[PDB]
């Protein structure tokens, strides 16, 4: 009956920064995933655990769509068993992942001529993220022994770093909007 609000997820004007990735629970609706896979706007479309064409057949309790913006080179990190800044301190997928990872270039939307600084990623953390955990704290990261009294300094770094997105950057440094469907049963 009701159609799944996938238009509001893939086609939204604004995408959250990766460190504060936005999750939108989707339920009580019917969607066609086959046309999603055969679309031409999606440069990257990986499905783990379930084949793309069988999605519309199987029934799932809930579907979560996490959306964010990362660099082009960091798209490989959105996958089970990966390491790096994104897969450790910003967005971590479980090893037993059951879902699809969709990404497409959004250089025209998410770049600025002088550099777009509205997209940030966590750069340090006291420990690796557990799967599907969001950390939006902006407390100063203490990399040494002396306590950082909320002030940047020696061995005291601000964890959030902003992507410098410009339309002239190479492909590996252009923003990519990523949507990660996660099927839970």
């Amino acid at each position: 009956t009701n159609l799944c609000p996938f238009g509001e997820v893939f086609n939204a004007t604004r995408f959250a920064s990766v460190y504060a990735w936005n999750r939108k629970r989707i339920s009580n609706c019917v969607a066609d995933y086959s046309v999603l896979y055969n679309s031409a706007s999606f440069s990257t479309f990986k499905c783990y655990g379930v084949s793309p064409t069988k999605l519309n057949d199987l029934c799932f309790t809930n579907v979560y769509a996490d959306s964010f913006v990362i660099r082009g080179d960091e798209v490989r990190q959105i996958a089970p068993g990966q390491t790096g800044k994104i897969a450790d301190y910003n967005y971590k997928l479980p090893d037993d992942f059951t879902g699809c990872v969709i990404a497409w270039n959004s250089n025209n939307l998410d770049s600025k001529v002088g550099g777009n600084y509205n997209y940030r990623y966590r750069l340090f953390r006291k420990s690796n993220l557990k799967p599907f955990e969001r950390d939006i704290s902006t407390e100063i990261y203490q990399a040494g022994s002396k306590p950082c009294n909320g002030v940047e300094g020696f061995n005291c770094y601000f964890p959030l770093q902003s992507y410098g997105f410009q339309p002239t950057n190479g492909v590996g440094y252009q923003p990519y909007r990523v949507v990660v469907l996660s099927f839970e049963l």
Partner: nanobody
Framework: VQLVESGGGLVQPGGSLRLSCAAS????????IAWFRQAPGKEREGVSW????????TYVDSVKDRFTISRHNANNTVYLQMNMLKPEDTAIYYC?????????????????WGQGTQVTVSS
């Protein structure tokens, strides 16, 4: 997991060629096959994708009708039938794989790479 790539050579413009990529160490069919060509002075660029578990080919726009990719289940080998070749197609062809059902244009997304083969289109 080992990939064996073969079938390259030299051909005149407008000709046809067939590339073979055999995947050995895969327990099941849940994987994908892709083809990347590296033009001299250019990074690897994907041209075709096939999800084995779904047998769903995909192509970039530039070769949308000139290339055809298919998998023969008997020998577990994927064939990339290249037709109407142009001098723009002269590059080293690699076939990759990944333990996922789908496609991705980033070569770093693929963990297993066969040794490349050279294809030159000239008169």
């Amino acid at each position: 997991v080992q990939l064996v790539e073969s079938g390259g050579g030299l051909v005149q413009p407008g000709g046809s060629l067939r590339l073979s990529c055999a995947a050995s160490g895969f327990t099941n069919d849940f994987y994908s096959i892709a083809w990347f060509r590296q033009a001299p002075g250019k990074e690897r660029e994907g041209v075709s994708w096939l999800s084995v578990s779904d047998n769903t080919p995909t192509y970039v726009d530039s070769v949308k009708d000139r290339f055809t990719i298919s998998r023969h289940n008997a020998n577990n080998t994927v064939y990339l039938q290249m037709n109407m070749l142009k001098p723009e197609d002269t590059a080293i062809y690699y076939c990759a794989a990944g333990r996922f059902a789908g496609r991705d244009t980033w070569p770093s997304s693929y963990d297993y790479w066969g040794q490349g083969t050279q294809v030159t289109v000239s008169s």
